Amino acid sequence: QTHAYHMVNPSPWPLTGALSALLMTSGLTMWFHFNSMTLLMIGLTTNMLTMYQWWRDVIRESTFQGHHTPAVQKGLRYGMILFIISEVLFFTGFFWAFYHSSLAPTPELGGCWPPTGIHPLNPLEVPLLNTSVLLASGVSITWAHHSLMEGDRKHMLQALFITITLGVYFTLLQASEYYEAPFTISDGVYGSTFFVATGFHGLHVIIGSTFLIVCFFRQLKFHFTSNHHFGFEAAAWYWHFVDVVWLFLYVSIYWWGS
Amino acid sequence: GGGVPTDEEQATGLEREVMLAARKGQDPYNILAPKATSGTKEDPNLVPSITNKRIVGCICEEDNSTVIWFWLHKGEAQRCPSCGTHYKLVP
Amino acid sequence: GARTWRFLTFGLALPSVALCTLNSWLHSGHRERPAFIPYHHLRIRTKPFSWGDGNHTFFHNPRVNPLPTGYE
Amino acid sequence: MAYPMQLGFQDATSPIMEELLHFHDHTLMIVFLISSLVLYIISLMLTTKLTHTSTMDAQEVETIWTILPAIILILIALPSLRILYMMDEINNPSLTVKTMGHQWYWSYEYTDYEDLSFDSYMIPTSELKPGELRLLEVDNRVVLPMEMTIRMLVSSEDVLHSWAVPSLGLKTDAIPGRLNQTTLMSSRPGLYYGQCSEICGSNHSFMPIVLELVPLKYFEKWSASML
Amino acid sequence: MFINRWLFSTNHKDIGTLYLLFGAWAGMVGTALSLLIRAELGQPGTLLGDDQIYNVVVTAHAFVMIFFMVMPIMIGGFGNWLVPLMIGAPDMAFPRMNNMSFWLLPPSFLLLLASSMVEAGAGTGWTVYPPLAGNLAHAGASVDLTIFSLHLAGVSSILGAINFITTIINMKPPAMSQYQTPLFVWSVMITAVLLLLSLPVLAAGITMLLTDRNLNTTFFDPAGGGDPILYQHLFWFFGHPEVYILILPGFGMISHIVTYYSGKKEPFGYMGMVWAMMSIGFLGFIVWAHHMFTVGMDVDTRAYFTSATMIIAIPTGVKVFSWLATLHGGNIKWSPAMMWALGFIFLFTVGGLTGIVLANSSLDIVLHDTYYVVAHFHYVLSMGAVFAIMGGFVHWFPLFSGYTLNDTWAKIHFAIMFVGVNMTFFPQHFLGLSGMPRRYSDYPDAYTMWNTISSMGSFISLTAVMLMVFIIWEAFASKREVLTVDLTTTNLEWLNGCPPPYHTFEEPTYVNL
Amino acid sequence: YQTAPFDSRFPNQNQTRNCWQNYLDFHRCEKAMTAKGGDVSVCEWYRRVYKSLCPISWVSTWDDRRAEGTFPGKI
Amino acid sequence: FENRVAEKQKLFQEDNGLPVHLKGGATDNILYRVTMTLCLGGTLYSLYCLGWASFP
Amino acid sequence: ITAKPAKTPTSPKEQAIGLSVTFLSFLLPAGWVLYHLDNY
Amino acid sequence: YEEGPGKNIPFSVENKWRLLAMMTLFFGSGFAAPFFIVRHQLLK
């Protein structure tokens, strides 16, 4: 070959991933309707195995085999931006649902927002703390990025550890707020919009934290150079996305919706 | 405050080949667009190849949307069948 | 620079988190639960939940989450 | 109702349906002309051995291709939006009737004065009386006064339905938790038929609408007799 | 070796071939569903059952034709085969992720066939509106299996969109600007942008439907303060872009076919064609509520959606006129592919024009949820999208296979299909204007003549579909190997031979500035 | 009184809030009159309008919920 | 910790014809076999579950 | 396009067999189901 | 991997009669499926 692009070795992970999607969806069907978690637990297991081996192989191809030329790296940058755009439009659907319900509250709610019988969380208590936590994590991840570009291994690891700690703190605070909330997902469209929008956000925080932990262990193993570290850049972009979604949730659901 | 490898230390495989060739001003992996000559029979466009034929696309005039494609073979210079521009294979 | 972003991490960002942690700390402690009223737009049950007895939400808190029939 | 081998709209029973027929005539002339011109030009491009295969300049001709369609669209939109705003105009109804969609029948409520309500079900094929229409007759028709502005309000007590009467130009979706309004005015006495116009399950095909348009005095006596 | 090649592929051509095989199989399923519809409608009275089994068939017909036939053939099949060859790229940007876009489709299809086998099926319409699609009126697993089918198809297409956009932006020769890529490549890039933005909104909406059905949410349930109309907005915000996704790759194939069989080096008005496709893509996001003119929205909202919808005729007309101007002065070759393309230009124009009729909210009151809508969309889908697929299939079959079709059989095929689709759908205009509703298993007696003729049409189309299978068999059975192909100087995908080697452009093209 | 007149507050196809507002207004009026020992006859207009516009099942359900203590509107 | 990347670069560039998903050695084969066995076996179980759910 | 003569020519008789088998593969199973609708 | 006509496909075209059987089964199964699903729904 005399181009710079990556011809990938034939791989089983696309098929295992597709079958994991069949097992998770047929598994959710079996859980919702036939009172059984068996297929779902097989699908989640095969999905985790597939993700692990697929991304392991991308690290082998890049760090170990040198297939990530600038042209390949530029493709991955576009791929991650486009993926983030698709996730923004997914959240847009949930914001649309929220504004539709809250701007024109129906007679069943008492014709008011919040609905009769809903006692919202105080946005100045744990939700404000959660806001400070994710904003702080956007600062610490930026410190980590600069440390890596400047060749500073110890400060990169410290800044990334702080970022992950804050992601975990957010997740534990949200778990506690879920438990303490006097309203539930079954509390009409208020509970529906609140828990589905914040719940998909929480999942994305867990995904983003996991991505940052992968970057932490790769950094511990010296995979990143001061100039070549796309996995870290992608995790940082994803992490900023999770921050920005939170700020929109905070202003929309917790503050303006209270 | 150090401990992060450099590309110079740790880049490998094709990434390293591209890095080292670029330091030398060389483009073995076709990252850059070649600059045209006058394209006469005396001053043909020189087309590198690792084999005895390569596809050429000729953008005959600036901003043409239509690219003209043809195999250029080792031997005497060939002409773009649209604009007559000369190309010569350098295997 | 890294130096500037570390300065912001320790000089602004983490102090903000500490102040908001103080603020949440101070306003914590259980507020009284409201009288139960069996409003038809709340405690929705169109299908049993796929866990427990079918009538408890996933992070049911007995202190503040009544069932359709009221507090446990 | 529709008749065998029908090509176009049911004859108009309301002034707005009349307006829709003339607007459809205007639009269809344009559709015919554009379809015909494209077919003709295709046939013209394909019927000569003469050739011209060198690069052709596009900008002059693209002016015609954009401006002439833009003018045609304006010539459709102007009468289109005149009719849209005519149907939306304030009218002052004499009567309000509600219809509620159900699986699979319509109920009607005339509650301006008395609590009058009833259910309207399709006549089964095996029970049709000689001369009656398969899948179109109901047991209890929606009796209404002719030559009077009527407010119809439409909702559902289950899934989506849609309340339609083509000869009056009516189709209003029946949505649970929502009260949709339309106006009905018949120029003529008679029987005017429609059918459920949103997929609603097993008997979607089998929950029709029959309006019975009569003079006010007859409507008043029917109303009293239905209490 | 067989498993490594066909289950573990990282090759754009083999993955394209898998998509074409999948889409062909899906087309047979969709055709059988269409024939069950027309068998019921071809005589008054009930043949199969009440509206439930009938609308399970209608629902499945639509999901199969759209998600399993058209999108996999146009995007997965023609896109994977042709896009890298037309830009001189050695494969797709993400050649392993490409394989997962393919392998998500068999499971998606399995979930749809499971939906129809369990309980009483999903008799909802392909729009899956609540509350009919909810857990009271459609209790049990069928609708949840349909939702999960759509989730897997959506992920397939979202990852495919990321792959196509990245490939087309990042993997051209360095001298080649976006304004030197072929129109088919533009048509796939624009389709991929529509998929990337539209499918996540569908995903959000059907996820809300899933939680209403299983987790006691009330997004769409008025008892909890929800609104069935919210579901319609979310669905159609996806659904209008979806129809542009179905046609845009067809427009790209028609531009290549008309150019090729006109003996031209280039389509007329390249930049106008690019402008037209980007304008259609953009306008396709701001018009969705033309699917909702009877739900009770405000008059000013109806006026806006009427006007914005009509605007799409302007860029679309530029494309139609530019195709005619491409024919103008051509050395016309009356190939089977050219016949498909000419059929497309005319029949797509007719369907586009009945769309303009429907864009008028005042007239749409009377035409909504009638066969007039069914006539409109089958002119653009069964005579537009399908004619572009058949033209591209007969045009590029020799590239993909290395063998030729029998051109006389292919012309016979075209003639039969042309008669059948027109006999099927033309009379549905009359049924619509006279008020026959959609999604009816049975109709008042007055509508018998046109339903009878329409059903006779559908049987002619079945004869065409059966003949197409025979024609593909006869090509592989006879093994006429390709020797020479004209116009390779302006059709790069042909320049590596028929079929091209597994690896093409290992040495990239030379293009200078 | 023939039927509910055009109300500029509710000029569009969706008349849900027109029914709701008149039901609330009648019951608020009835409560204000019964409280002072005044005359519910003053509330008649709101009663005629909500009876004209409101589905029987909506009124019936709202009445049931007022009696249960589960009506979510302020009266 | 120490930088052992060069040792992994040598292992993963060995000219042994192994695809990247098996090039780590015997552990890769085991994890592949576990993954594919759970996938194919789970898929057969999902088809049995359809068979069951297809009848009252 | 130009092409070689067929490597394995398919005679009119062979085409009649292929066309017949293809049509029967579509028609017989559907035919059996639709014939037996009354029984279902 | 094998290259060239008849070799870049997951099915054999070595024997036109075996191929006719495979194509018959392939396209015939897709066309038959909806009829058998309708039969299945009617027999509940």
Ligand code: HEA
């Ligand atoms: C791509 C989309 C598409 C296509 C092609 C078709 C094709 C056909 N459709 Fe339709 N149909 C829809 C999408 C489509 N349909 C949708 C979205 C609905 C609405 C559903 C709802 O209301 O919810 C619908 C509804 C619908 C109805 C209305 C049902 C009702 O309201 O009760 C009818 C009625 O006759 C009908 C009939 C047909 C017929 C006879 C064909 C025939 O023309 C089909 C003939 C066969 C083909 C055209 C070939 C197919 C195969 C290929 C092209 C593969 C080729 C192989 C290779 C390239 C190797 N369909």
Ligand code: HEA
């Ligand atoms: C490939 C698929 C496809 C395409 C491309 C289109 C294209 C268009 N569609 Fe259609 N449509 C469908 C598939 C498609 N549609 C489907 C499936 C449904 C039903 C969904 C369901 O309910 O299940 C539907 C429904 C639908 C409705 C809803 C009707 C209702 O349910 O009551 C409307 C409303 O405006 C609409 C309009 C249009 C318009 C204006 C275009 C325009 O893009 C057409 C533009 C083209 C032209 C106008 C022709 C060429 C132009 C010229 C030659 C220039 C000169 C022309 C003029 C000056 C007018 N269509």
Ligand SMILES: CCCCC/C=C\C/C=C/C/C=C\C/C=C\CCCC(=O)O[C@H](COC(=O)CCCCCCCCCCCCCCCCC)COP(=O)(O)OCCN
């Ligand atoms: C701390 C934040 C992290 C969240 C993790 C917690 C739970 C499991 C996973 C959640 C994933 C995210 C969203 C899914 C939807 C619902 C969960 C919302 C978040 C949540 O956890 O909500 C809880 C309800 O959970 C429930 O019903 C539980 C429901 C569990 C089953 C989930 C069903 C999944 C639905 C399928 C998803 C489809 C994805 C589509 C992909 C796109 C393809 C195109 C709230 O508890 P509660 O007791 O009602 O009220 C609190 C009272 N004290």
Ligand SMILES: CCCCCC/C=C\CCCCCCCCCC(=O)O[C@H](COC(=O)CCCCCCCCCCCCCCC)COP(=O)(O)OC[C@@H](O)CO
């Ligand atoms: C309880 C929760 C369960 C749900 C499952 C999901 C959970 C966790 C997933 C966490 C994501 C982990 C991703 C790890 C990727 C590791 C591979 C990697 O980072 O690979 C990098 C390339 O990036 C790349 O592929 C970029 C790869 C990016 C992909 C990540 C996208 C996020 C995944 C979202 C998954 C589902 C979200 C949708 C939910 C609705 C390798 O290039 P460099 O880093 O430049 O190294 C090379 C240098 O060493 C050379 O000197």
Ligand SMILES: CCCCCC/C=C\CCCCCCCCCC(=O)O[C@H](COC(=O)CCCCCCCCCCCCCCC)COP(=O)(O)OC[C@@H](O)CO
């Ligand atoms: C109800 C339950 C339904 C859920 C069904 C779930 C569906 C499927 C199961 C998913 C299994 C995922 C397994 C991991 C896939 C990783 C893909 C990846 O990371 O792909 C990368 C490309 O995409 C990129 O970067 C950027 C894009 C990365 C996207 C990664 C994963 C996406 C998974 C879900 C996304 C849906 C989005 C939600 C919003 C609508 C790498 O491309 P490759 O071609 O591999 O390599 C190219 C080589 O040069 C690398 O060295």
Ligand SMILES: CCCCCCCCCCO[C@@H]1O[C@H](CO)[C@@H](O[C@H]2O[C@H](CO)[C@@H](O)[C@H](O)[C@H]2O)[C@H](O)[C@H]1O
């Ligand atoms: C590695 C491959 C080989 C391993 C194969 C996996 C074997 C697992 C089979 C066990 O099946 C389980 O049975 C439980 C009870 O028998 C179910 O709990 C169900 O019943 C419980 C109580 O009976 C409820 O509390 C739960 O909500 C409910 O899901 C559970 O769903 C289901 O998974």
Ligand SMILES: CCCCCCCCCCO[C@@H]1O[C@H](CO)[C@@H](O[C@H]2O[C@H](CO)[C@@H](O)[C@H](O)[C@H]2O)[C@H](O)[C@H]1O
């Ligand atoms: C590598 C291959 C992949 C491994 C495939 C493994 C398949 C075998 C799983 C065993 O099957 C289970 O049988 C249980 C019967 O005991 C079911 O119990 C469930 O159904 C019971 C019915 O009695 C109820 O008591 C409960 O809901 C629950 O225990 C459960 O659903 C089901 O999974």
Ligand SMILES: CCCCCCCCCCO[C@@H]1O[C@H](CO)[C@@H](O[C@H]2O[C@H](CO)[C@@H](O)[C@H](O)[C@H]2O)[C@H](O)[C@H]1O
């Ligand atoms: C919409 C797609 C389908 C369109 C129509 C297809 C045309 C039908 C083709 C013939 O199908 C066959 O017809 C036979 C009858 O002609 C059936 O035999 C049935 O009738 C025979 C004669 O009475 C008996 O001997 C058999 O046992 C009995 O199955 C036979 O099963 C069936 O395969």
Ligand SMILES: C[C@H](CCC(=O)O)[C@H]1CC[C@H]2[C@@H]3[C@H](O)C[C@@H]4C[C@H](O)CC[C@]4(C)[C@H]3C[C@H](O)[C@]12C
């Ligand atoms: C001793 C070790 C050296 C790493 C190395 O250079 O190989 C150091 C450098 C940075 C350290 C990490 C960072 O200081 C951040 C964390 C600090 C906590 O107090 C312990 C865990 C924690 C995650 C540290 C673990 C470990 O001591 C690390 C990883």
Ligand code: CUA
């Ligand atoms: Cu009621 Cu359709």
Ligand SMILES: [Ca+2]
């Ligand atoms: Ca029938």
Ligand SMILES: [Zn+2]
């Ligand atoms: Zn040239």
